[PDB]
Structures are given as structure tokens and as C-alpha cells.
Design a protein around this nucleic acid. Structure first.
Lengths: 129, 221, 87
RNA sequence: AAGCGCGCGUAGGUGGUUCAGCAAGUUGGAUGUGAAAUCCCCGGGCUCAACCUGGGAACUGCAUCCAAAACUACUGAGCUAGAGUACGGUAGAGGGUGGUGGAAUUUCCUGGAAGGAACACCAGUGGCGAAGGCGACCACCUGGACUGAUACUGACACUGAGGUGCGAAAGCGUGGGGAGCAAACAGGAUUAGAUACCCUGGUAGUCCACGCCGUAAACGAUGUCGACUAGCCGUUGGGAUCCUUGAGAUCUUAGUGGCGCAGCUAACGCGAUAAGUCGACCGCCUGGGGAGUACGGCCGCAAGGUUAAAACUCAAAUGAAUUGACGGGGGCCCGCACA
């Protein structure tokens, strides 16, 4: 069966990043919608598109660079099994800090830059690089 | 130039079958029509207009281009539409190694330079088979009398058969242009030209677009 | 399967806003009636284990449908365990 | 080197979906400590270094306390996608019981009488079942999926150590049968010899009922499950689209195959039935021998099986691939090599 909601979306776009398709649609949750909103603010994707009907869905409009697109890999860290609840002193600066390292906290599912300057740690979700 | 009545006249909108196609030419299929796939006729218009812009802005900048139209049904005009142009060309058996085996084949051009006594004279048995092999060079070296060292631009016709000639071109970095049909991939060519190369009269719609434009690049200089 | 007269008969007490054929009154107790009448062919055919692997497949799924009624509705569970000749 | 042969599923691990609540995990600060020593820096001293201490740093730890609510558990009401059922319709060597068959062949005898066994064609890179497995004809009592939709359930979920059934054939039980072959053998021809392949002969066996063994080159040498990433050509079952006469295209699915990119791979090659990208879980591996063997436990009437070691011993065994050589390997060709 399917066992993890957001690892099912982070896999399904990377094989579409190496494919020639642009609009990815899947049955989505609020959990998958709160993740999608933060990396369009980091310049990676745009227009998450809650379908706003019954069985609501996410149409993430991923951008292309010329040739190889903008997101090489999305590495899951906290999958559901070993779920990597991590503090604020130990946040991962993924690729020198050029990965933004989104971490689920109480006051927001938020990048590692604002996770440290307002100090709450928690679920280190995925590599965005 | 860009007008439809000779764009529609011969062979262009025809294409390869739904049995025979690569979906990388899936941006260039204008409807399915009797199970053969149609060149996309409306964004053709920027591409083979840019095929005449880039060919003249370096002919005024002193390049020299090669013509690989290496097909049996298409080598006829390639001897004719590249004679009106000042370009080197080869239309029958691209020898695998041109512009890579070059400093070997640089001195494999000369069977006429070294026999400027007897081909003007008639050494009968020992000079006939040397002069029967005098067309063994210009069968593949037909336009390769003038070379200038290494080529600067490259224009291809048949990507599907001679995929070598583009993997020759990407192996250096020489800019690639050429007509592509829905059978092969439009990938490896730098900027695309969608268009058929299976009809015979569809060939010289671009080859007489070259001889129109090759003087219109030399006029700037 | 079950008899064409019977499979439409036994639903007549499973109704509970009668358009339900989906609540576990139906998939227990059509399926309990599947348990109680298809015992017959085993006595003649005891050399075919293909037909009682379906029995253990749904008497577990009956118990799985008993398992959800352990927490969701204990009161209507008494209509199942008190009736049907269970246990 | 390594996927149990596969199931049902106990604990457990993890768990679609929404609001609200809790504050156990998670997050921050507060306070007591985490002894001193040791260590880590700045030093002070031995004339210098050890050594000696002073100062701190460090001690990722522990409970208590208040603050937080994105996510997890838990709690409650739900939501319909996962999963199930009410309705036919076929497809289908599912599987079993009892019969009815035919030709050979075999065995008799004057073409008939007699009984065993597998059922040419239909046969299919076909179906069916979790798997093992399974084809003459015929009824009879019975499975699970597919699909066409229409109804309803409200995650009821998948996986699962143990646990529990069920697993090809030679077997040996406990009773019968009886053709051909043939395990067991006798010779015949053969070689230093047959104890061999060839030759003449035949009981155990396959069959049946119950029961036991639980073995495998159980092999697709690929655990189950779901998700997603170019294709193209046959082929199986539905269904709908289709100018329609189908000679049939297209589409739609659930199986079964070919070839190929992206992709991975040590390579062979896999390639939407992955051997990719992933996720949950399970089984399994740690150099070759010793060894799947001893000993102990369990099962079997026995043959044995299952779980499973070290002592010793060797610096290598192994995998795919390439050149050369070799071949009682094939295929062409050359020469009095063959007349």
C-alpha cells in the first residue's frame, strides 16, 4: 500500500524532472500543500493549484532551465520510518546553505534560515537542492 | 521565403508513419492524418526564417559551411544546389572520420595535384587504374576541394540515417542546423528546423532557400 | 455461490435504511450465511483445499469486520454476537 | 555469498483523508546537577620540557517547571480516493467425484472376446490458481478475479518474527491393481574391463482410498504491496468509441509477450510485469574449504529431513566480459587431400 503522503509526491516529480512534462497532478492533502508553498517562495516552482473540489489535487507548475532543470534531487530524510526529529543547533546546511532545508515547526513548515533565527527545530523534511 | 503556397506545394506536410516515429518530435505533430505524422506548420515559420538569418550574418562575418545531404534520392540536388553555393559538400558515403581523422585525411585530398602530367596527356596500364580511382576521391570528396582547415557551421538534411554527422558536429562544438522529420529526434541539433526529407521535390524548398540566402550573406561583405 | 432466491432473501433483515448493502451487517452476515451453507460440498469433495481458503479468507475478514465494530459500535455489535449463532 | 515454494494472519513496525482537542515523542527558555580528577584553552612555576596547579571551557546527560501546536500517537465527529459487498454477463487444461470413449500397442484365439495407462489435432511468448500446479467426452456439488455500470461501507489499511495450514516426483507406509516401459538384475554383443550407453527379458512403481514425509535447477536462479517517469509491434479476456458493410482501426482497461530511450547495471542485460525513482515491512548474506556437516532439540517406521556450530586449513575461491589457444563445435573455401 501507500504509506507516506509526501514522499509519494517528492518521488513523482523527480522522474518527471528527467521526463519532458510540466504540470504534475496527483491527489493531494493539506500536508502536501503546505510543503509546496514554501519552495515557490524560494524560486523553484510556482502556482501549487489546489483544485478546490471533492478529491482535491495539486497542480504544481515546475519551471525548466534550458536543458537540465532547476531541481536535481529531492532527498527524503525523515521518511516515515526513521523520522529525524532534529534540534535548532543541528540543522543541515545541505549544499553549503544553498539547499534551504525545509523543517516542520510549530509556527511554520519553514526553511532552515528562519528556523535558526527564530529557534524551533523538528522534522527535517527533505533536501530541496 | 516564408510563404505558404510553396510551403504547401511539395512533400513538406507529409511525414513518417505512426509505426515509425520518435516522440521527441511530439512537439511537431500537426494532427494525425492517415497514420502518418504531420510537420507542425505554424511554428515552422520562425525556425526556417531563422535558418536564413543565421546563415547570412556569418557569411557576412566570413564563415564557410558544409552540406551533409547524404542520401541517395537527395544527392542529386546536393551536387546542384551546393554548386550554386560556395560551400563544401558531401552527398554519398560520409566517411566516418571527416573532421575527426582530419590530419590523416587532410593529405588524402590529392590524387590530382600529384598527377599533373599524365591526366593532361593520357604510363598507360600503370596510370589507368590510378585514374579509374580518380573518381574514388570526389565521390566522397565532391565539394571537399576547398576546406580551409576545419568547418565553421554545419547544415544537415537526414538526421535519421546519418546520425553520425551530427555526433560528428557535437563532438567539436560547431553549431548545428538542419531539417528534421518525425522519425528521428530533434535533439543534438542546436536549433530545430521541422520539415520532411522523404519526397524529392520537398528537398529543394530549403536547398533553393540556401542559394537565395548564400548570396544574401556574401553581399554584406 | 449462494442460491439466487437466498442471496436476495437474507438482506431483508440487514436493511437499516435499506439501501445499505455496505455496512458490516451485510459483509458479515451475507458472508456468515456463506459460511453456514457452503459446508456441504466439503463432505463430498475433501480433496480440494481451494474452496476453504476462501472460507478462511473471509472469516478473517468477518473477524476484521468484527474488529472495527470492537471500537466503532459496541452496541450494534451485540446484534452480531448475540445473534447468528456465533462463537 | 544471499528471496522461505508460497499463503492465512498474532504481537509488532508503519499507516489515505478534514476540522477541533490533548500535549506522550517532537521545539525553545528557566533551575538543580552532571562530584573532584582527567581532558580542552589562557596562564603561573620548576633555568626548559614533562610535571604542577589557578581560572574557565567542556561534560552532547537527567528529571522538574512554564511557553508552543506544523507534524505523529492518542481522543471525538467525519470525508471517499484504499479496501470490501447487493446486480448479471461471458472467458477460464480452476479442482474433484462417477461414467462414457477411441485408436494403436499389448495379451490371447478363431475379424471378434478381454483390460490397463496417457489422451495426436484443437495448443497458443494462451487461460487458471497465493503457490505447487493442471488438457478425449459428459453431467453433477462447488472457487477467486475481471468488467459493465448502478448501489452502500467510512481506512475497516498493507506488511508481518513467532504461529499456522498448504506444497513436483522417486518413496516407504495401509490396503488393491496390472498393459507398455522401467528403477532391482540376468546374459547378448564391447572394451585391459561394463560394473556403461547399445541387445533379449521383469517384479517395486506410477493408479486408487486415507495417511505420512515437507524434499527441490519449487527457477523468472528475481519477497509481498502501492505509487509514479518516452515509446513502438503482436497477443488474452471484458467494455465503449467507430461511415460501416468488418477485411476490421482507434480507445479503454485487467493479464501475457516482443523491442527500446530516459533510467540503472560489474558486465551480460533489465527496461510501466524494472533489475529506475521511491515508501512501508519481511526473509536472507558477511572469503573459500571444513559444511548444510557433526553434537543437542523436533518430526519420520525407515531412508532421513529441519534448525545449525566451532577445531583446523588456505590467500585466495567466485562473477560477467575480452584476446589467444583448443574442440570427436557448426558453416564456407583452398590444394592429387579423395578415383
Amino acid at each position: 500500500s501507500m504509506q507516506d503522503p509526501l514522499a509519494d509526491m517528492l518521488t513523482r516529480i523527480r522522474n518527471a524532472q528527467m521526463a519532458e512534462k510540466t504540470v504534475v497532478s496527483m491527489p493531494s492533502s493539506k500536508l502536501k500543500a503546505a510543503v509546496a508553498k514554501v519552495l515557490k517562495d524560494e524560486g523553484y516552482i510556482a502556482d501549487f493549484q489546489i483544485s478546490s473540489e471533492v478529491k482535491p489535487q495539486l497542480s504544481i507548475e515546475l519551471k525548466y532551465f534550458e536543458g537540465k532543470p532547476v531541481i536535481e534531487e529531492v532527498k527524503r530524510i525523515s521518511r516515515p520510518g526513521l523520522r529525524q526529529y532534529k534540534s535548532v543547533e543541528q540543522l543541515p546546511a545541505v549544499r553549503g546553505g544553498l539547499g534551504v532545508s525545509i523543517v516542520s515547526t510549530n509556527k511554520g513548515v519553514m526553511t532552515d534560515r528562519a528556523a535558526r533565527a527564530a529557534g524551533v527545530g523538528g522534522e527535517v523534511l527533505c533536501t530541496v537542492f | 521565403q516564408v510563404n505558404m503556397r510553396d510551403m504547401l506545394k511539395a512533400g513538406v506536410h507529409f511525414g513518417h508513419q505512426t509505426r515509425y516515429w520518435n516522440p521527441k518530435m511530439g512537439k511537431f505533430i500537426f494532427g494525425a492524418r492517415n497514420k502518418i505524422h504531420i510537420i507542425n506548420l505554424e511554428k515552422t515559420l520562425p525556425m526556417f526564417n531563422e535558418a536564413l538569418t543565421f546563415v547570412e550574418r556569418l557569411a557576412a562575418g566570413k564563415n564557410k559551411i558544409l552540406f551533409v545531404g547524404t542520401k541517395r534520392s537527395a544527392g542529386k540536388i546536393v551536387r546542384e544546389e551546393a554548386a550554386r553555393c560556395g560551400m563544401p559538400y558531401v552527398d554519398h558515403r560520409w566517411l566516418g572520420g571527416m573532421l575527426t581523422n582530419y590530419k590523416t585525411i587532410r593529405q588524402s585530398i590529392k590524387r590530382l595535384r600529384d598527377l599533373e602530367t599524365q591526366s593532361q596527356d593520357g604510363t598507360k596500364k600503370e596510370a589507368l587504374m590510378r585514374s579509374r580511382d580518380l573518381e574514388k576521391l570526389e565521390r566522397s570528396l565532391g565539394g571537399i576541394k576547398d576546406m580551409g582547415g576545419l568547418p565553421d557551421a554545419l547544415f544537415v538534411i537526414d538526421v535519421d540515417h546519418e546520425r553520425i554527422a551530427i555526433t560528428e558536429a557535437n563532438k567539436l562544438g560547431i553549431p548545428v542546423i538542419g531539417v528534421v522529420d518525425t522519425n528521428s529526434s530533434p535533439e543534438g541539433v542546436d536549433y530545430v528546423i521541422p520539415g520532411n526529407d522523404d519526397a524529392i521535390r520537398a528537398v529543394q524548398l530549403y536547398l533553393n532557400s540556401m542559394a537565395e540566402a548564400v548570396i544574401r550573406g556574401k553581399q554584406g561583405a | 455461490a449462494l442460491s439466487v432466491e437466498e442471496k436476495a432473501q437474507i438482506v431483508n433483515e440487514y436493511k437499516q435504511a435499506e439501501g445499505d448493502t455496505g455496512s458490516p451487517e451485510v459483509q458479515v452476515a451475507l458472508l456468515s450465511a456463506n459460511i453456514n451453507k457452503l459446508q456441504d460440498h466439503f463432505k463430498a469433495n475433501g480433496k480440494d483445499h481451494h474452496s476453504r481458503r476462501g472460507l478462511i479468507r473471509m472469516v478473517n475478514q468477518r473477524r476484521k469486520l468484527l474488529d472495527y465494530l470492537k471500537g466503532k459500535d459496541v452496541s450494534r455489535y451485540t446484534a452480531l454476537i448475540g445473534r447468528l449463532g456465533l462463537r
